[PDB]
Paper text:
Motivated by the crosslinks observed between the Spc110pNCC and γTuSC, we sought a higher-resolution structure of the NCC region via X-ray crystallography. Previous work indicated that Spc1101-220 is only weakly dimeric. Using the proven strategy of fusing weakly interacting coiled-coils with stabilizing domains, we found that an N-terminal fusion of Spc110p164-207 with a domain from Xrcc4 produced high yields of soluble protein. As expected, the electron density map was consistent with a coiled-coil, with interpretable density for Spc110p164-203 residues. When the coiled-coil was docked into the 6.9 Å cryo-EM map using cross-correlation in Chimera, the X-ray model occupied most of the alpha-helical cryo-EM density. Given the observed pitch of the coiled-coil in the crystal structure, as well as density for larger side chains, we were able to assign the register of the NCC. We observed a significant number of crosslinks between the N-terminal portions of Spc97p and Spc110pNCC. Thus, this region and not CM1 was responsible for the coiled-coil-γTuSC interaction apparent in the cryo-EM map.
Microtubule (MT) nucleation is regulated by the γ-tubulin ring complex (γTuRC), conserved from yeast to humans. Spc110p, a distant pericentrin homologue, recruits this complex to the nuclear face of the spindle pole body (SPB), while Spc72p recruits it to the cytoplasmic face. In yeast, the CM1 motif is required for seven identical γTuSCs to helically assemble into a γTuRC at the SPB.
Residue numbers in the entry:
A (entry chain B): 3 to 24, 27 to 76, 83 to 174
B (entry chain A): 1 to 76, 83 to 174
The structure:
């Protein structure tokens, strides 16, 4: 998955969180939350095909914009009454949409929020663990390079002393 | 300031994960803020420097030991208790066959839970980004040295071949 902070136009004051889980080409789940409510939509490959056909765009580029847009200067839109989500690719004060998706309001949003925070805390734990091994490996590699430099200097010294 | 976010389970709500966020401006011993949240509501309490010393005294515990226990329990066997009707949070130390209360706190139901939850998530997302940056730099520094190693080793081997031939 990827969790991105976004601002909606209808609510520029606060930060929303866009959680996308999936390659995206084979349909995905998109979740929006403001820390209280949550909206979730499962986008099928069928629904994807119908969006790229309604706007006459290449699959690869379309998914590429999805990939470039959903995982993170794009703008994001969501109406809490119609529950339709869409984003635009902006360029030169000119913009166009990449389809819309329906995000149904979730009955028990606290479950989603809890899961999102747990995911982040688990990720932090995993990254710290990885860093501990990488620190040691980095230090070992620097030490081994120093050893080789000293070993190589010894060889050159022996060659030059040999010459004379 | 600094903070620590911990996952806990409550005796009275064993199924749901709660999050305990403890933060301090200077140091834990000089005052901290303790927030409990289930991802929907949040309760917060401020603990002053003098309240810590008074709690240690009421417990007939040496202040350093009391603070040491707060660190082990609130920053992360300890049990956590909270009731959404009393807004009263206490945790206990459980040794073999016996437990005892390690101080308690009265939390106040926050008025803006969503704001607190968003700020907490943002903190985690910022930490993930910083940790990913750190990993990327560590791995590049390691890989850069390995490349220099392999380059230097080409010369080392040639010098060995030259020296072996000359000393042969």
């Amino acid at each position: 998955r990827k969790i991105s902070r976004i601002h909606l136009v209808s609510e520029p004051s606060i930060t929303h969180f866009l959680q996308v889980s999936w390659t995206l080409e084979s349909g995905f789940v998109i979740t929006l939350t403001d820390g209280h409510s949550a909206w979730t939509g499962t986008v099928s490959e069928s629904e994807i095909s119908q969006e790229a056909d309604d706007m006459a765009m290449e699959k690869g580029k379309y998914v590429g914009e999805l990939r470039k847009a959903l995982l993170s200067v794009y703008t994001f839109n969501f109406s809490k009454e119609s529950c339709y989500f869409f984003f635009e690719k902006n360029l030169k004060d000119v913009s166009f949409r990449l389809g819309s998706f329906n995000l149904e309001k979730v009955e028990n949003p606290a479950e989603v929020i809890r899961e999102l925070i747990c995911y982040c805390l688990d990720e932090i734990k995993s990254l710290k663990h990885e860093i501990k091994e990488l620190r040691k490996e980095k230090n070992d590699t620097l030490n081994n390079y120093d050893t080789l430099e000293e070993e190589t200097d010894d060889l050159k010294n022996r060659l030059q002393a040999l010459e004379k």
